[PDB]
Amino acid sequence: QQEYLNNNQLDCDNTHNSTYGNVCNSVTSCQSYLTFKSSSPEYNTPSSISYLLNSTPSLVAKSNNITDVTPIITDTMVTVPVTCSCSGGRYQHNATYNLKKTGETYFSIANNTYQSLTTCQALMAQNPYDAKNLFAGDDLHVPLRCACPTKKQSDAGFKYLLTYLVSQGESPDSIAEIFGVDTQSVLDANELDSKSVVFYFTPLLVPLKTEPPARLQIAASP
Ligand SMILES: CC(=O)N[C@@H]1[C@@H](O)[C@H](O[C@@H]2O[C@H](CO)[C@@H](O[C@@H]3O[C@H](CO)[C@@H](O[C@@H]4O[C@H](CO)[C@@H](O[C@@H]5O[C@H](CO)[C@@H](O[C@@H]6O[C@H](CO)[C@@H](O[C@@H]7O[C@H](CO)[C@@H](O[C@@H]8O[C@H](CO)[C@@H](O)[C@H](O)[C@H]8NC(C)=O)[C@H](O)[C@H]7NC(C)=O)[C@H](O)[C@H]6NC(C)=O)[C@H](O)[C@H]5NC(C)=O)[C@H](O)[C@H]4NC(C)=O)[C@H](O)[C@H]3NC(C)=O)[C@H](O)[C@H]2NC(C)=O)[C@@H](CO)O[C@H]1O
Ligand SMILES: *[C@@H]1O[C@H](CO[C@@H]2O[C@@H](C)[C@@H](O)[C@@H](O)[C@@H]2O)[C@@H](O[C@@H]2O[C@H](CO)[C@@H](O[C@@H]3O[C@H](CO[C@H]4O[C@H](CO)[C@@H](O)[C@H](O)[C@@H]4O)[C@@H](O)[C@H](O[C@H]4O[C@H](CO)[C@@H](O)[C@H](O)[C@@H]4O)[C@@H]3O)[C@H](O)[C@H]2NC(C)=O)[C@H](O)[C@H]1NC(C)=O
Ligand SMILES: *[C@@H]1O[C@H](CO)[C@@H](O[C@@H]2O[C@H](CO)[C@@H](O[C@@H]3O[C@H](CO)[C@@H](O)[C@H](O)[C@@H]3O)[C@H](O)[C@H]2NC(C)=O)[C@H](O)[C@H]1NC(C)=O
Ligand SMILES: *[C@@H]1O[C@H](CO)[C@@H](O[C@@H]2O[C@H](CO)[C@@H](O)[C@H](O)[C@H]2NC(C)=O)[C@H](O)[C@H]1NC(C)=O
Ligand SMILES: *[C@@H]1O[C@H](CO)[C@@H](O[C@@H]2O[C@H](CO)[C@@H](O)[C@H](O)[C@H]2NC(C)=O)[C@H](O)[C@H]1NC(C)=O
């Protein structure tokens, strides 16, 4: 289990513990998965998505049953295999981001560019620049959100945790159905209960018994 971000990432003066990253509470490194919605024209191939998220094109291709050069229609969700490791008491997967235009902010980078796979709080904690003093060309250390299964999760047969980007209209039930897991395990993974509200544009951990479905668009259809 990890705390649910609960929209605390949308206010960069908020200092809730969850915003600094999942907590290192199990094995210190593991295989994990992110998700990402194809964004045209900058982040819609295995090469560009892997560049942003520091995966590899072959890993993205294999995970989604495409080739390493197959373009991906805008707004399609793809799985992104990554290594998740402990650093400074947190689980994260490291990437690097060079700002493209002055006017980008820790918030726009975390929320828009990285689609809530990181938070402005973790970016600020792990980079030297003041929020009001960022410019094109600055290179940021990006701590992407991932975790490794706890002992309790592992004993239940969960081999991986996947960071899932929630879209408008989904629920813990509909997301669990995509992956063939029970809704209660999704709730447990995020320290939520059956009445908890889950927001769109906020990530949610999904425990997996096996590799995720290769094409999520069809898994997500009713
Ligand atoms: C039958 C049944 O039960 N069905 C169930 C379903 O109902 C259910 O589905 C769920 O249903 C829910 C209920 O409907 C629904 O909940 C709703 O969810 C909504 C979406 O989340 C939510 O809306 C949210 O609400 C939040 C909270 O209010 C809003 O958050 C605010 O957002 C603002 C942006 O829009 C934030 O602001 C920005 O803040 C940042 C700082 O953090 C700031 O950044 C700084 O900017 C300055 C410049 O301006 C920067 O400074 C500059 O820096 C540069 C670079 O250095 C310099 O060059 C420059 O000089 C310098 N300038 C200056 C002047 O200094 C600075 O650097 C930045 N700082 C940093 C660190 O980067 C920005 O400027 C701010 N922007 C603006 C525009 O002001 C604001 O902080 C934030 N507020 C808070 C408090 O966080 C969101 O906007 C809003 N989102 C939307 C889309 O509207 C609703 O409230 C929810 N409602 C309820 C009732 O809960 C669920 O989503 C829904 N789920 C799903 C999946 O559909 C399901 C599921 O449970 O179940 C069914 O069963
Ligand atoms: C941010 O969150 C961190 C994670 O918190 C937990 O995880 C999430 C998912 C939720 O479930 C949340 O409710 C959990 O708390 C949090 O770090 C945690 O902080 C607590 C503080 O209470 C630590 O508890 C202390 O643990 C020791 C034993 O260590 C245990 O944990 C470590 C973690 O790996 C394991 O390695 C060990 O094997 C143990 O399992 C206890 O000795 C101690 O109890 C008290 O004992 C003395 C004597 O009474 C008191 O004087 C002390 O004050 C102690 O309170 C603590 O309870 C917990 O270990 C730690 N976990 C991890 C993984 O780091 C962190 O504090 C949060 N930060 C902020 C700023 O909120
Ligand atoms: C990964 O993607 C490829 C390409 O999209 C999928 O290959 C397609 O799947 C079917 C099932 O194996 C192939 O076999 C044949 O399909 C036809 C469908 O009419 C059927 O007549 C045959 O009996 C046979 O099942 C199909 O040719 C193939 N299409 C292409 C263009 O290669 C593949 O299934 C995907 N794999 C996974 C694990 O998702
Ligand atoms: C990811 O980046 C972090 C820094 O954000 C690196 O953290 C180091 O982790 C090792 C091993 O846990 C420690 O010895 C260092 O002291 C840590 N540094 C900090 C600043 O916390 C981490 O090495 C990076 N991981 C990978 C795999 O590249
Ligand atoms: C956080 O990022 C999301 C995208 O990841 C933003 O959603 C976009 O909002 C703009 C409005 O400026 C729309 O044109 C886009 O269509 C939206 N994208 C999607 C995928 O729906 C969102 O505005 C950002 N900010 C907040 C506070 O959520």
DSSP assignment letter at 41: T
Method used to obtain the model:
X-ray
- How many residues in total does the chain contain? 222
The answer to whether 96 and 142 have CB atoms below 8 angstroms apart is: yes
- Kindly give the number of the ligand 4 atom that is closest to the alpha carbon of 85: 27
> Does any ligand 5 atom lie closer than 6 A to the CB of residue 1?
no
Q: Could you tell me where the beta strands, DSSP code E, fall in 49-191?
A: 77-87, 90-98, 139-144, 160-165
Ligand closest in space to the Cα of 19: 2
CA 178 from chain centre, in angstroms, equals 17
The residue whose CA is least distant from atom 7 of ligand 3 is 65
Instruction: Say how far apart CA 204 and CA 3 lie, in whole Å.
Output: 10
As given in the structure block, the two tokens for residue 100 are 């493209």
List residues bridging with 98 in a β-sheet: 139
List residues bridging with 92 in a β-sheet: 85
Instruction: Say how far apart CA 94 and CA 122 lie, in whole Å.
Output: 11
The answer to whether 32 and 205 have CB atoms below 8 angstroms apart is: no
Tell me the structure's resolution in angstroms, rounded to a single decimal.
Answer: 1.4
The answer to whether 78 and 71 have CB atoms below 8 angstroms apart is: no
The closest of 179, 168, 166, 122 to 145, measured between CA atoms, is 122
As given in the structure block, the two tokens for residue 197 are 């509200």
Burial of 68 (0-12, 13-18, 19+ CB in 10 A): middle
In the chain, domain spans: 1-222
- Kindly give the number of the ligand 5 atom that is closest to the alpha carbon of 37: 20
Instruction: Report CA(3)–ligand 1 centroid distance (Å).
Output: 19
In sequence order, which ranges of the chain are alpha helices (DSSP H)?
A: 46-53, 57-64, 106-108, 120-125, 151-155, 172-179, 183-189, 216-219
Cis peptide bond prior to 41, omega within 30° of 0: yes
